[PDB]
Amino acid sequence: GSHMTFVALYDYESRTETDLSFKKGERLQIVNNTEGDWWLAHSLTTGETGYIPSNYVAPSD
Ligand code: NI
């Protein structure tokens, strides 16, 4: 709940208001994971927030 972050595996460009654009290697907090395919995430690396494809991240663990 504050102990885990995820790492971006690939670059992703959002053209939607609510998606997050990110680069591979960013450190992300998962905010909402109620759905399996799209998660609300916050990038600690950029300070930006938005939905991400869950297949584009893996736990940093
Ligand atoms: Ni935690």
What distance in angstroms lies between residue 19's CA and the mean position of ligand 1's atoms? 23
What distance in angstroms lies between residue 30's CA and the mean position of ligand 1's atoms? 10
Comparing CA positions, the residue from 25, 30, 29 lying closest to residue 12 is 25
Edge to edge, the sheet with strand 49-53 lists: 49-53, 38-43, 27-32, 6-8, 57-59
Round to whole Å and give the CA distance between 1 and 29.
9
Round to whole Å and give the CA distance between 38 and 51.
6
Hunting for tokens 């960013």 — which residue is that?
26
35: its two tokens: 């759905």
Tell me, in Å, the resolution of the deposited structure.
1.0
What distance in angstroms lies between residue 21's CA and the mean position of ligand 1's atoms? 23
What distance in angstroms lies between residue 11's CA and the mean position of ligand 1's atoms? 25
Comparing CA positions, the residue from 15, 4, 18, 5 lying closest to residue 48 is 18
Walk me through the domains of the chain, giving residue ranges and CATH numbers. Answer: 1-61 (2.30.30.40)
